[PDB]
Design a protein around this nucleic acid. Structure first.
Lengths: 82, 121, 80, 85
RNA sequence: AAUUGAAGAGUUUGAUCAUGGCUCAGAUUGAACGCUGGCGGCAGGCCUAACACAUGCAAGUCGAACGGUAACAGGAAGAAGCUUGCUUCUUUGCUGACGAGUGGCGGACGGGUGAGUAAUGUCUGGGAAACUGCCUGAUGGAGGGGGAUAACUACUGGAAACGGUAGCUAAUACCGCAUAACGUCGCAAGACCAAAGAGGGGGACCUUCGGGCCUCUUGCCAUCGGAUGUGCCCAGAUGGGAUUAGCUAGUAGGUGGGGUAACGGCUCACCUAGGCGACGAUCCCUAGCUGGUCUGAGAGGAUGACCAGCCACACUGGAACUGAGACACGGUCCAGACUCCUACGGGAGGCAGCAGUGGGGAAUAUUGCACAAUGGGCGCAAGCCUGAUGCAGCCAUGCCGCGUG
RNA sequence: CCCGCAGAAGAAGCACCGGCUAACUCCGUGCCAGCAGCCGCGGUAAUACGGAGGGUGCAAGCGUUAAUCGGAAUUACUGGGCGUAAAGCGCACGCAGGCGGUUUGUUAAGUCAGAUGUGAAAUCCCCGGGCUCAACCUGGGAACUGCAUCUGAUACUGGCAA
């Protein structure tokens, strides 16, 4: 299935996850269709700890993309009732 | 078998055709074709074999078109003559694997290895 | 509406088919001189209409044979 | 035994026997339609076509004929029994 | 904001000026060797033998498909220390759960390697003739039967993969009948093709007392869509050698027949004699290709280590089966150029997965921990698996920072 | 990561010094031993060999080797030459190919302009942010100098006509 999932792209002990849409069969850091946004688990003063293109996530959910547990959690954190 | 007999080889290390140059054992022994030892040369060899063309060494006859007679009168005849290559001094098989049928008279002394490696006895 | 390539015909000895040379004016990647290059395409012919030396317009289609993938001249019904 | 590759070998053998049986029966019916075409008589060719058609449709439904083979077999033999006249 | 950018010198000569080669100062590395060596962070680490591999793991899961209980728990008609549960029966699947089995999905992903491959490959740009499990939208069905088998039971094959011989049983295993259209074939009339349940809770009624009945969840089938993956075509680009110039009969087109999911010489019969090539065909040698990387002021020259995309291979050479997807790393069947293994007759295996061993080399690491995270497989979920991955170990291998006041 | 404790405490080598190339004297040896990338040094006063002292570079590294590019404009498209330094076929006719005097009309193939799709992400460059800093990770842009398609111009080239 098409999945909207995280891809670990950071350095050692400091991960930086790219929230990305990809086929489920591909590797974690491999081929993807489009890049929705990002999420840094390392906490900071910035409001860009997580950024998501919710329009693209809605478009792919309508197309049939499934959402991972971490992506659903990040969508619950990045909403109108934040 | 006899002198000037072209023979096939069963073992892998022995390569294609061999020709008997002397019939070992005895003074004017003419025909020895059952489990006897014969001196051979290599008349045509493939490069995959360890031996090469023109190398003199011993053999033991394993299959013969004349055929060995069993005690009850049974005759086991093989199409085409075959031998297994042996060292001149140690009289042990150079070839690691034996191909083809062998006969139960090849059981005495150093030929248990030949019939153990052989498929059909 | 449709991609068309235009070129002269080299042999009509094929039955229901022709070979068309398309000449392209390309720049050399290093020396910069505009050199002329030729691409020869096997083109399907209907009713053997194209005879040698004729400039014809060809259109990409499904593979009609091995090495054949192009088609007829122009619009049908003989527009004048 | 517990390894899935061995159970896959068992299942592949059983499915090959089953699929060979069904493929053999549909090729027998198709070669019946072709033999009646080569005979040149239309009534037995139409009866053989009417006997072949549910079998080839059913095995396309079950999943080894993949329905475009069924379409091609029906289309070709309908064309041939109509060209028999 | 996003080309802010170019250094020469030594050496021919008695001396000069040219030409011209040689050499140096610079940057770079998957580097090696010698000398020396404190710490940390990030990255890198078999460049040869695609040589041969000991040992351990690298692909399983679902009891919410099913028969069932091989283990672990909860229930005891039988009498007990003459204490009444502090332990036990011909026992039972009754429940939770579960060895093995049938079945479903996954084993085609992820991981490795660069051997082949100078063009069924790659990069860039176009096309139609196609399929597409799992994910999603719309519409409509989901009715009723049958036969078998594994497990099992008894016998039994020198103890090969382990097979046979009888009997019994279940399913979301299998096969028919009905149904039949916006599906298939057909110019039309018409003909034809589908399936399967399970789980959870419940007013009344009837009842095996398990259900019919009412919901809910999920599952099934058909068709048309979407999305995604894949197959196919065309054009351009893609090393060297012309001391390699002529190669090609399924070769080149056509028409019929077959074949594929689909166009197609893909294949066959027949006809026509065509096709490619000096804009390099064919042959030989070499080579995975790209994004990129190093140098360079650029244009170029070199190169494809890591990382990411695409291709190809899985002891060698073939071949098909299952399946949506393979002609399949840890799947089958053959041959063998190899090692183990008898009941010497009867067979097993394939690290170019992760460690590691031998060898080769100038040289390249641990037979470590964890699924905590991110991914994948199964499942409704808990969860199980994951040598992907996250980490750690070793090595000054590179970059960077700090220290030795 | 922070705090605390003791004591400068536990922590410096490698190459070079004739010119290119920053840094020079003395002792030993005497075309020997030996150095060398090139020129070249050594045959009794050696800044060139081997030690010492001094100095110069780089520094947890430093030299040597291998391989690439640069310098090399020494394969020259940018960007070379051919009288004598290497180089004009002994000469001519000539097919392919390359290039073409002048005017007008037409086409827009090359050419130019604008737009659209793509040119994956990463890397490279710019503006920021996070690791105490840097390396490293990362937001956005720029770039990907390319290809295709649509529209427009007609000066040069190409086609056609006169």
């Amino acid at each position: 299935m098409v999945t909207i999932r995280l891809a670990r792209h950071g350095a050692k002990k400091r991960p930086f996850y790219q929230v990305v849409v990809a086929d489920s069969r591909n590797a974690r850091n491999g081929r993807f269709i489009e890049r929705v946004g990002f999420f840094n688990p390392i906490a900071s003063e910035k409001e860009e700890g997580t950024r998501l293109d919710l329009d693209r996530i809605a478009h792919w959910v309508g197309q049939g993309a499934t959402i991972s547990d971490r992506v659903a959690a990040l969508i619950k954190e990045v909403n109108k009732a934040a | 078998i006899q002198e000037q007999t072209m023979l096939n080889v069963a073992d892998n290390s022995g390569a294609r055709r061999v020709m008997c140059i002397k019939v070992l054992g005895g003074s004017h022994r003419r025909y020895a074709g059952v489990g006897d030892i014969i001196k051979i040369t290599i008349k045509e060899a493939i490069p995959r074999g360890k031996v090469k063309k023109g190398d003199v060494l011993k053999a033991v006859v394993v299959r013969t078109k004349k055929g060995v007679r069993r005690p009850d009168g049974s005759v086991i005849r093989f199409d085409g003559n075959a031998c297994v290559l042996l060292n001149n001094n140690s009289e042990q098989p150079i070839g690691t694997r034996i191909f083809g049928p062998v006969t139960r008279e090849l059981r005495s002394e150093k030929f248990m290895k030949i019939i153990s490696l052989a498929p059909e006895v | 509406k449709i991609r068309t390539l235009q070129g002269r015909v080299v042999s009509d000895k094929m039955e229901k088919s022709i070979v068309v040379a398309i000449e392209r004016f390309v720049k050399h990647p290093i020396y910069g001189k505009f050199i002329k290059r030729t691409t020869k395409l096997h083109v399907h012919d209907e009713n053997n209409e194209c005879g040698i030396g004729d400039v014809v317009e060809i259109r990409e289609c499904r593979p009609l044979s091995k090495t054949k993938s192009w088609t007829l001249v122009r619009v049908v019904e003989k527009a004048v | 035994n517990i390894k899935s590759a061995k159970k896959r070998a068992i299942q592949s053998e059983k499915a090959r026997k089953h699929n060979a049986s069904r493929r053999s029966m549909m090729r027998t019916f198709i070669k019946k339609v072709y033999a009646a075409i080569e005979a040149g008589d239309k009534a037995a060719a139409q009866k053989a076509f009417n006997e072949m058609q549910p079998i080839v449709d059913r095995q396309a439904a079950k999943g080894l004929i993949h329905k475009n083979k069924a379409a091609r077999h029906k289309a070709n033999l309908t064309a041939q029994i109509n060209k028999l006249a």
